[PDB]
Curated annotation (Swiss-Prot):
<dbReference type="InterPro" id="IPR022834">
    <property type="entry name" value="AONS_Proteobacteria"/>
</dbReference>
<dbReference type="InterPro" id="IPR004839">
    <property type="entry name" value="Aminotransferase_I/II_large"/>
</dbReference>
<dbReference type="InterPro" id="IPR015424">
    <property type="entry name" value="PyrdxlP-dep_Trfase"/>
</dbReference>
<dbReference type="InterPro" id="IPR050087">
    <property type="entry name" value="AON_synthase_class-II"/>
</dbReference>
<comment type="similarity">
    <text>Belongs to the class-II pyridoxal-phosphate-dependent aminotransferase family. BioF subfamily.</text>
</comment>
<keyword id="KW-0663">Pyridoxal phosphate</keyword>
<feature type="binding site">
    <location>
        <position position="235"/>
    </location>
    <ligand>
        <name>pyridoxal 5'-phosphate</name>
    </ligand>
</feature>
<feature type="binding site">
    <location>
        <position position="133"/>
    </location>
    <ligand>
        <name>substrate</name>
    </ligand>
</feature>
<dbReference type="InterPro" id="IPR015421">
    <property type="entry name" value="PyrdxlP-dep_Trfase_major"/>
</dbReference>
<dbReference type="InterPro" id="IPR015422">
    <property type="entry name" value="PyrdxlP-dep_Trfase_small"/>
</dbReference>
<feature type="binding site">
    <location>
        <position position="23"/>
    </location>
    <ligand>
        <name>substrate</name>
    </ligand>
</feature>
<dbReference type="GO" id="GO:0008710">
    <property type="term" value="F:8-amino-7-oxononanoate synthase activity"/>
</dbReference>
<dbReference type="GO" id="GO:0009102">
    <property type="term" value="P:biotin biosynthetic process"/>
</dbReference>
<comment type="function">
    <text>Catalyzes the decarboxylative condensation of pimeloyl-[acyl-carrier protein] and L-alanine to produce 8-amino-7-oxononanoate (AON), [acyl-carrier protein], and carbon dioxide.</text>
</comment>
<feature type="binding site">
    <location>
        <position position="354"/>
    </location>
    <ligand>
        <name>substrate</name>
    </ligand>
</feature>
<dbReference type="Pfam" id="PF00155">
    <property type="entry name" value="Aminotran_1_2"/>
</dbReference>
<feature type="binding site">
    <location>
        <position position="207"/>
    </location>
    <ligand>
        <name>pyridoxal 5'-phosphate</name>
    </ligand>
</feature>
Length: 390
């Protein structure tokens, strides 16, 4: 190539191919659900975060339809649908303070970016769980705060770090449910530390929202915590089945985010019909149907926990919809995932740097849309694969 940099990319792609690490995106021809048409094939998927099986729900299809007919296609841009959703989210997810507000964002990434750039800065120390999802970490870097990592879920280690720090502003930042492992943060102990040390507690409930707590209100609601130190970031494209994200907190925290977060974080609002559909999804999540779906999800989790132990590989003990199975090397993990693919099962393979070296793993993600027969197929293929490799 006259553009010699293209030759560099071509050789770099060839190296990725030779090593067998070429990533492929699958194209889904049907709505997202347990059963899908994937690259033209009928498959059972364990790859999504559609934990309650709502992404394909006809009520949400109708909500998008009614929302587009009422509010148009694009935001251009704060629609009444966005304002209503913020009211709905404050009532639904803001029970930990008596005067909550919520702010809707296009993506969970932007919600975290707004929160950390507004509340952190030079002179701030941010204390971050060592297993926080990667993009949470990049949001802190831009904020320019001093970042101190604490060992995963270790409140006693974090307490010693808070005690040793003389920073005027301290933020504790943690996922509530850790997306590659399925465990739940020790929120009650973290809040005790936050109140003792006068710190904010920013928690990302992406994987707890809708699936934990009374009416699915989330991990903070499950722990029944009440404190204005709490700032909850959530996403609306996982259990809630649509898209977007939010921050919910004391109204003064929300007003500060509005005044101080970089304006571009608020620009290019999502399509207003999506916000209208999220409001409809909250009515499912918090009603009898959401309770039924969570109960079925809990039964699938119980079954899957046992299935994983019957394989020869290394389960991560999880009581959430995330059921990881650690195979070890990239090569072995990819071979097992490929064997499951030949059984028409789509199970993602996770590799470093997303997980620590030597812990490449399957990420089996359950959905209330899954059936017991789906799990039987997964078990049968896992066990046949284990015999083939033994």
């Amino acid at each position: 190539h006259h553009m010699q940099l293209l030759d560099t990319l071509e050789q770099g792609l060839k190296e990725i191919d030779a090593r067998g690490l070429r990533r492929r995106r699958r194209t889904v021809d049907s709505p997202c659900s347990a059963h899908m048409t994937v690259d033209g094939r009928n498959m059972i998927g364990f790859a999504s975060n559609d934990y309650l099986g709502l992404a394909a729900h006809p009520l949400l299809v109708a909500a998008i339809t009614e929302g587009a007919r009422r509010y148009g296609a694009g935001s251009g841009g704060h629609s009444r649908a966005h304002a209503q959703l913020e009211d709905d989210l404050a009532e639904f997810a803001g029970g930990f303070v008596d005067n909550p507000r919520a702010l809707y964002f296009s993506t969970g990434y932007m919600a975290n970016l707004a929160t950390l750039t507004a509340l952190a800065g030079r002179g701030t120390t941010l204390f971050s769980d060592s297993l926080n999802h990667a993009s949470l970490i990049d949001g802190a870097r831009l904020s320019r705060a001093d970042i101190q990592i604490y060992p995963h879920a270790d409140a006693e280690a974090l307490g010693a770090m808070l005690e040793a720090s003389d920073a005027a502003v301290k933020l504790i930042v943690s996922d509530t449910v850790f997306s590659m492992d399925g465990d739940i943060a020790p929120l009650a102990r973290l809040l005790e530390l936050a109140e003792h040390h006068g710190a904010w507690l920013v928690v990302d409930d992406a994987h707890g929202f809708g699936v934990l707590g009374p009416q699915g209100r989330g991990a903070v609601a499950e722990a029944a915590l009440r404190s204005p130190h709490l700032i909850v970031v959530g996403t609306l494209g996982k259990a809630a089945g649509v898209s977007g994200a939010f921050v919910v907190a004391h109204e003064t925290v929300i007003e500060w985010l509005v005044q101080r977060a970089r304006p571009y974080i608020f620009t290019t609002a999502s399509v207003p019909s999506a916000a209208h559909a999220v409001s409809a999804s909250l009515r499912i999540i918090g009603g009898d149907e959401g309770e039924h779906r969570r109960a079925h999800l809990r039964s699938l989790i119980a079954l899957t926990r046992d299935m994983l132990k019957s394989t020869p590989w290394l389960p991560v003990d999880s009581h959430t919809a995330v059921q990881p199975l650690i195979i070890g090397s990239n090569e072995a993990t990819l071979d097992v995932a490929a064997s499951l693919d030949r059984a028409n099962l789509w199970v993602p393979a996770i590799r470093p740097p997303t997980v620590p070296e030597g812990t490449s793993r399957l990420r089996i993600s359950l959905s209330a849309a899954h059936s017991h027969n789906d799990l039987e197929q997964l078990e049968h293929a896992l066990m046949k694969t284990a015999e083939a490799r033994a």
